[PDB]
């Protein structure tokens, strides 16, 4: 019996440095008008490993909403390079927008993310110590990945 | 002024020389898997040892893929399959960085075939015009040309357009690619007109309708895409009823180089 | 309805290098006697994504022009490469013979043009800059979009 849809993602801003918000052009779509009950998350995964090493980027609290059809942009500050790891800091990574209704999580939207430096000189010998400011995040438009799961509106 | 219409009134409709070159590829294929450390390119790239490469690699292309998409016959000519080699560059400067040792010895695996091919000019030349005719044809270039102007200029300018600008997303939209069997949308008809699909308005103007046709399909008659669709559609009907008695000549012209690069 | 027809356009210059002007023999006639005189212009479609890209590279003002048969040759120096976007320099556009009378214009005869490289080689990997001097117009083998602006 299910309420809402996404339609789209865009994935903005992309290419970019790797300090810049997230930008995401989400569009979804209700049959009914709505009470103050969504929840859009965009997580930063960017531990391969560990989900002790995520973080959450922002929380927002779409609702009451008219039945039809609504496209907006969510702004996401950048993932704070303190809580990442060494290792783990150039290459594919992991973005997720999801949204939640009432308490369930009903659509995941996973992006893999590729974290590189742009300059030509460093590419080649990667200093020990990641210098994120010199990184450059090309996230992976064209290929989304996405989980839609069953729940109970 | 005359009765000037969207259709046109223009009707074309009519050792094979690819085995020759076909071949020549496979020949100058050998010689690619046949020269210092150019192994690593051999075979589609192992999923296993290289962990995440096709994550960073969206189109990836190999030696053996080159070999089976020409035994399939997909290079009408020496251009499509040179930048198929340029792929291969392309592809290792992303994963392992362009002033890289595998960057910089798959430049030479196109090298010596770019500098093959400046040697074997004089057939090559002769061999692709026997296959794809209209090749240098001046009015396929000029229609073509009018064709992409009506797309980025008039079609893809259109108000709230953006969804029909690429492709429906099959992960996104599950069940559009059960209802429409024929997908069709504005890059894609670019993508046709760089390689040069259209020779008249019909074959256009199908893949033109399909837009408005697929969305009447799947969001219906009444439905808010329709009518984006609608006006989409309409710009370039407009544009062609315009262009008619200009398109008209070189449709025809078109028509007569085909025909004539046939019998003689 | 017009006053003067044009009976033929020929290209006596091309294939050449870019920075080359043009030449064209128009073969025009004319089926009454003229007050004043027609003014004729060669524009160059810088960009064929707007209007404000382009360029007028001469302008002659034939005249005072009687009836009869008229035979003339119309020169225009080459666009200036500073002034064409990044884009729209390399591969193909559109070059505009326009005759205006009593400062109406009243015919736009717009031919195709395809500017490449000739050595197979900035051609292969086109250069990040266009190149104009190594970069070779041909005027296309086809017809050219006549517009006769139908007020005169």
Same mark, same amino acid.
């Given at each position: 019996?299910?309420?809402?849809?996404?339609?789209?993602?865009?994935?903005?801003?992309?290419?970019?440095?790797?300090?810049?918000?997230?930008?995401?052009?989400? /569009?979804?779509?209700?049959?009914?008008?709505?009470?103050?009950? #969504?929840?859009?998350?965009?997580?930063?995964?960017?531990?391969?490993?560990?989900?002790?090493?995520?973080?959450?980027?922002?929380?927002? =609290?779409?609702?009451?909403?008219?039945?039809?059809?609504?496209?907006?942009?969510?702004?996401?500050?950048?993932?704070?390079?303190? #809580?990442?790891?060494?290792?783990?800091?150039?290459?594919? /990574?992991?973005? #997720?927008? /999801?949204?939640?209704?009432?308490?369930?999580?009903?659509?995941?939207?996973?992006?893999?993310?590729?974290?590189?430096?742009?300059?030509?000189?460093?590419?080649?010998?990667?200093?020990?110590?990641?210098?994120?400011?010199? =990184?450059?995040?090309?996230? =992976?438009?064209?290929?989304?990945?996405?989980?839609?799961?069953?729940?109970?509106? | 002024?005359?009765?000037?219409?969207?259709?046109?009134?223009?009707?074309?409709?009519?050792?094979?020389?690819?085995?020759?070159?076909?071949?020549? !590829?496979?020949?100058?294929?050998?010689?690619?898997?046949?020269?210092? @450390?150019?192994?690593?390119?051999?075979?589609?790239?192992?999923?296993?040892?290289?962990?995440?490469?096709?994550?960073?690699?969206?189109?990836?292309?190999?030696?053996?893929?080159?070999?089976? %998409?020409?035994?399939?016959?997909?290079?009408?000519?020496?251009?499509?399959?040179?930048?198929?080699?340029? !792929?291969?560059?392309?592809?290792?400067?992303?994963?392992?960085?362009?002033?890289?040792? !595998?960057?910089?010895?798959?430049?030479?695996?196109?090298? *010596?075939?770019?500098?093959? *091919?400046?040697?074997?000019?004089?057939?090559?030349?002769?061999?692709?015009?026997?296959? @794809?005719?209209?090749?240098?044809?001046?009015?396929?270039?000029?229609?073509?040309?009018?064709?992409? %102007?009506?797309?980025?200029?008039?079609?893809?300018?259109?108000?709230?357009?953006?969804?029909?600008?690429?492709?429906? @997303?099959?992960?996104?939209?599950?069940?559009?690619?059960?209802?429409?069997?024929?997908?069709?949308?504005?890059?894609?008809?670019?993508? %046709?007109?760089?390689?040069?699909?259209?020779?008249?308005?019909?074959?256009? *103007?199908?893949?033109?309708? !399909?837009?408005?046709? %697929?969305?009447?399909?799947?969001?219906?008659?009444?439905?808010?895409?329709?009518?984006?669709?609608?006006?989409?559609?309409?710009?370039?009907?407009?544009?062609?009823?315009?262009?008619?008695?200009?398109?008209?000549?070189?449709?025809?012209?078109?028509?007569?180089?085909?025909?004539?690069?046939?019998?003689?």
């Amino acid at each position: 019996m299910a309420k809402v849809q996404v339609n789209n993602v865009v994935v903005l801003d992309n290419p970019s440095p790797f300090y810049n918000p997230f930008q995401f052009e989400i /569009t979804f779509e209700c049959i009914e008008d709505l009470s103050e009950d #969504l929840e859009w998350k965009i997580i930063y995964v960017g531990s391969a490993e560990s989900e002790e090493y995520d973080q959450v980027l922002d929380s927002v =609290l779409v609702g009451p909403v008219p039945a039809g059809r609504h496209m907006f942009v969510f702004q996401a500050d950048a993932p704070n390079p303190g #809580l990442i790891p060494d290792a783990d800091a150039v290459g594919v /990574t992991v973005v #997720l927008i /999801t949204c939640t209704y009432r308490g369930q999580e009903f659509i995941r939207v996973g992006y893999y993310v590729n974290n590189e430096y742009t300059e030509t000189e460093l590419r080649e010998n990667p200093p020990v110590k990641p210098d994120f400011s010199k =990184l450059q995040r090309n996230i =992976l438009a064209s290929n989304p990945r996405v989980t839609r799961f069953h729940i109970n509106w | 002024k005359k009765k000037r219409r969207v259709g046109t009134t223009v009707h074309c409709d009519y050792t094979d020389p690819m085995v020759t070159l076909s071949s020549i !590829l496979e020949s100058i294929i050998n010689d690619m898997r046949d020269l210092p @450390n150019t192994y690593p390119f051999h075979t589609p790239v192992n999923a296993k040892v290289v962990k995440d490469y096709y994550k960073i690699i969206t189109r990836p292309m190999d030696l053996q893929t080159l070999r089976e %998409n020409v035994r399939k016959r997909l290079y009408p000519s020496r251009e499509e399959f040179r930048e198929h080699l340029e !792929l291969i560059v392309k592809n290792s400067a992303t994963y392992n960085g362009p002033k890289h040792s !595998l960057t910089q010895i798959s430049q030479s695996m196109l090298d *010596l075939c770019d500098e093959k *091919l400046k040697e074997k000019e004089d057939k090559l030349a002769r061999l692709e015009k026997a296959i @794809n005719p209209l090749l240098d044809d001046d009015d396929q270039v000029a229609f073509s040309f009018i064709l992409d %102007n009506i797309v980025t200029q008039k079609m893809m300018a259109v108000p709230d357009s953006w969804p029909f600008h690429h492709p429906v @997303n099959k992960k996104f939209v599950p069940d559009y690619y059960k209802v429409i069997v024929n997908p069709m949308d504005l890059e894609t008809i670019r993508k %046709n007109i760089s390689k040069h699909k259209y020779q008249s308005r019909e074959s256009f *103007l199908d893949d033109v309708n !399909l837009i408005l046709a %697929n969305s009447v399909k799947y969001n219906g008659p009444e439905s808010q895409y329709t009518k984006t669709a609608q006006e989409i559609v309409n710009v370039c009907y407009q544009t062609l009823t315009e262009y008619d008695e200009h398109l008209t000549q070189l449709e025809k012209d078109i028509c007569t180089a085909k025909e004539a690069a046939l019998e003689e």
